[PDB]
Every structure is written in C-alpha cells, then in structure tokens.
Amino acid sequence: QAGGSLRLSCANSGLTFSTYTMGWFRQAPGKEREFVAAIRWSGTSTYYQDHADSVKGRFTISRDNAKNTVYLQMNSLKPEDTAVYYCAASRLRAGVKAPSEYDYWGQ
Amino acid sequence: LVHLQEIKVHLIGDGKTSLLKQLIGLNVVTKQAPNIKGLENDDELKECLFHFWDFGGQEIMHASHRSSVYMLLLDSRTDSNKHYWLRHIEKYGGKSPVIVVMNKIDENPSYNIEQKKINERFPAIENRFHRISCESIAKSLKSAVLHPDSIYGTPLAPSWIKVKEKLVEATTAQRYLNRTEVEKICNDSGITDPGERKTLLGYLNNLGIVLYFEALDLSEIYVLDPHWVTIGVYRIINSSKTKNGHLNTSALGYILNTYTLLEQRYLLDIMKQFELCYDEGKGLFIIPSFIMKYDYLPSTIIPRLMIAMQHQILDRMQWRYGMVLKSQDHEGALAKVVAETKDSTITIAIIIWYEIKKINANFTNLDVKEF
Ligand SMILES: Nc1nc2c(ncn2[C@@H]2O[C@H](COP(=O)(O)OP(=O)(O)OP(O)(O)=S)[C@@H](O)[C@H]2O)c(=O)[nH]1
C-alpha cells in the first residue's frame, strides 16, 4: 500500500562475486533501466554504496554474505513510483562505478 | 581484483581544531576507521584509510599543495566570505563530495544559513550539513566517501598496488623521483604504457601520497613527497621576512634549518616553477602574496601579475596587495594595480589586461565582471 514497506531479496550463488557488483534497476514502462541502488560488497566490506533520486532513507540497500543475498527495503513508497525491479551484475575490473557494464541481468 | 580503500579529506576553513577534536595538525594526518569517533560502529568501512589536510590564513595560498571529500568549515563572522572557498572547491580540487559544516553555534544559537540555496547552487553537497558547536558528521562522511564521483573502492590490478607501495617506499626517503627511476619502477611490473603509468601516477597524486605536476619542467624531480615538499613552500611563503615583501638573497637556511642547501636550491627552482615569485636581481624576491570584479577573487592573481618585474615598475613600490608600474615602452606612462580582498576587486591606474587575461585563463568557467 502507499507509503508502506517491502523487502526484496535477490540471491546469487557460485559466481565471480569479487568481480561482480549488484545493482537494482526499476523500469516498468520501458524506462531504459534507470539506476536505483548498487553495491560492490566484498564480505563485510562495501565500496560503491550509492543511491539516486529517491536516495537513502526512502530506499535502503543492504547485502548479507551469510546466504549471498542483496536486500532492497522499500519505505514511504510513493504510488506513482510504480516500476518493476531487476538485478544486474557488473564484472569489469577497470574503472569503478560501471553502469554500462551491468551486462549479466538477473532473474 | 584488488581495491584501493583510501581517500583524502581537505578541511577548508577561512574550527579546524574543532574537527581535530574528532580525530582524538598542520595538514597531512592519517587515520583508520577505529580512529574516527562515531564512524567505527560501521564495519562496512573498517579497512578504509583517511587522509586529513587543513590550512588557514589570509595570504597563505596553496591551490595545488576528485579522489577526495571536502568538508567546508563556516563561522558566523566569516559567513560574508562564503562564496570564496565554495567556488574554490568547484574550480580546483575535483568533482569531490562536499560537506558544509557550521561551527561555533553556541555563541549564536539562532543563526542558520540558507542551506537549501547553496545546496542547489553546489551539486556536490546534496544536503550534508551540520550545525554543531564544540554526531551527524560521521554519517555525512560515510555517505560522502562511497560515491561514484570519488575513488574509495576502485578495482585495479594488484601489480598496481605493489608499484604504489614501492613508490611510497622510495619517496618517503628520496623525496623526489627521477623520470628514469619512475620508468624503472613502472617496468618492474612491466607496465610502460604512457596511459597506464599516467593513470597510476594520477591515482597516487589525487590521493595525496606522492605528488606529480605537469608543469615542473625539471629533470631532477619527477614526483615529490607532500610531507616535505609542501611544508617547504609553507615555510618560505611566510617567515616574517616575506611579510615586509622581499626575501633575502639565499637566506633560506635561516628560514628552514632533513633539509639542506641542495634541497634549498631544489625548492628554490620549484618555487620559481610554480609561478609564485620572481628572483629579480642581486638576490631580490617579490613574493607578491580599469574596474574589474571577480567572484571568488583568486588569491594568487597578484603573485602571477607581479612576475613581470623587468617590465613596468617605478621603484620597489609594492603593497603586498598592490604595486606601481612605470612603462619603459614608447612614451611614458605611470601605472599601478592594487587588490582589495574585502571587496574582491582589482584597480588599474594609468598589456596589463593581456597579462591579467593570461593569468585568469588558468580557470574553468570563472565568472568575471568588468566596469
Ligand atoms: N576553548 C575553546 N576555543 C575554541 C572553540 N572553538 C574555537 N575556539 C578558538 O578558536 C580559535 C581557532 O579558530 P579556528 O576556526 O579553528 O581558525 P583556524 O582553523 O585556526 O584558521 P582557519 O583559517 O583554518 S579557519 C582557537 O584559538 C580556539 O581557542 C571551543 O569550542 N572551545
């Protein structure tokens, strides 16, 4: 419901991991895969950890290494912000914060 | 691959001790996540290096001592001169995240700046503000470090980090590398691409461990150590002998003193190369630190306009904020250019405009006003 909560979990098993960054992209009406929140987490460490537009507090991003999962927490959801979320994996190790390198699309 | 996990922070005042209370330093101090109070709770950045630099003064002007975070510092009496350091961060530095903090709120608990207007005016802020006196500073710092416009987690080959460590080991003692030695260390790992070596040196410089400029033009020194080569410029730029306006012939040993006469004339050549002063003759030194108005009046525009010493000058007539000129060209003209920091203006008494434009050309979209 409007301004509620919604935790989405995206799991990846047996892949590069270290050479991989997980980014969430929201685009329902062909919105050209707009960037929402990415994380280059390596164990307890985290390198990129950046947001866009709605920013933090509104949207929370976390990663747990216990089951190799990334969690997107939806809070104060604005009804017009209706879009479908996709997981994307970046693998290039030359140049941090690589949007165009999110080639391996998730589920 | 292997990431870098390092960053530099320059404190930009007009305070600095107040933010040194969060550290528990004449710039260039190193800290880790446990060292910072209030940010050690997050294990996200446990293995992160922090470099803190800070200065302050009126005639002290070292524009070049992303890949950093700038915490601008404000005080109620200095809010009139606020556009200065903000435009300085916009022009020089990089595209680094900026955190504006207002300090000493206890003396005036009713003063708050219009943070919205400056936040929209400066897109590197993004509402990272504090109004504390002597913490949200830790949260702002964390949210600023992990930014695409900054380098904290950057994937580079491990050979690059070995080369960086070897360069640090060489520079902490030698203090100045040769181009031959730079290439030798670079090709120790086999890397000889000018682009690759250029990026490695840029990541070494923009993080402020080993400096490197494109205007040295000296074969004796290629890169250089900020722990000594910047403090050296700091000593000579003000020693109460340059306050009067003229430095002695070679009495830099009286100023300074690991530093000797060889390093003395190394740094002499360096300071003439940085376009800060002119050697005139017989060991004389200037150290210069119509209606034309500049927002963010560059601190070193008079030092660059006074390099033309063998040109129009009447006789040793310098205000340390101005000068007097006497045209030696065809006919006879008397001129004088003087600066006013409190008004951010320059005056002209009656080539001069050509030199002013040639000096201000080294700026990126610096607004100017003529009257
Ligand atoms: N006792 C005490 N003194 C303070 C406090 N805050 C500021 N001061 C005083 O302010 C002075 C320093 O002002 P400060 O804002 O740090 O200027 P600065 O950093 O030295 O100069 P700058 O150009 O880089 S901004 C010190 O003398 C210090 O005593 C405080 O909370 N307690």
Residue numbers in the entry:
A (entry chain B): 13 to 119
B (entry chain A): 447 to 460, 464 to 473, 486 to 526, 532 to 600, 607 to 729, 747 to 778, 798 to 858, 871 to 891
Quote the study's own text.
The Roco proteins are a family of large multidomain GTPases, with representatives in all domains of life. The minimal domain arrangement that characterizes this family consists of a Roc (Ras of complex proteins) domain bearing the GTPase activity, followed by a COR (C-terminal of Roc) domain that can be further subdivided into a CORA and a CORB domain. The first important structural insights into the functioning of the Roc-COR domains and the associated GTPase activity came from work with a Roco protein from the bacterium Chlorobaculum tepidum (CtRoco). Bacterial Roco proteins are simpler, only consisting of the core LRR-Roc-COR domains, and hence lack the kinase domain.
For the Roc domain, unambiguous density allowing side chain interpretation is observed for some parts of the domain, including parts of the region that interacts with NbRoco1. However, while the density for GTPγS and for a large part of the Switch 2 loop could be well interpreted, the density is ambiguous in some regions around the GTP-binding pocket and absent for most of the Switch 1 loop. The map also allows us to unambiguously place NbRoco1, although it is generally of lower quality in this region. Compared to the position of the nucleotide-free structure, the Switch 2 shifts to a position much closer to the P-loop that is not compatible with the dimeric arrangement of nucleotide-free CtRoco since it would sterically clash with the adjacent protomer. In the GTPγS-bound monomer, the N-terminal part of CORB (residues 798–891) undergoes a global rotational movement of about 30° in the direction of the dimer interface of the nucleotide-free dimer. NbRoco1 binds to CtRoco on the interface of the Roc and CORA domains and the hinge region connecting the LRR to the Roc domain (including the α0-helix). The CDR2 loop mainly interacts with the Roc domain, including the interswitch region, while it can potentially also interact with the C-terminal end of the LRR-Roc linker. Indeed, superposition of the current structure on the CtRoco dimer shows severe sterical overlap between the NbRoco1 CDR3 and the LRR, Roc and LRR-Roc linker of the CtRoco dimer, and, to a lesser extent, also between CDR1 and the LRR-Roc linker.
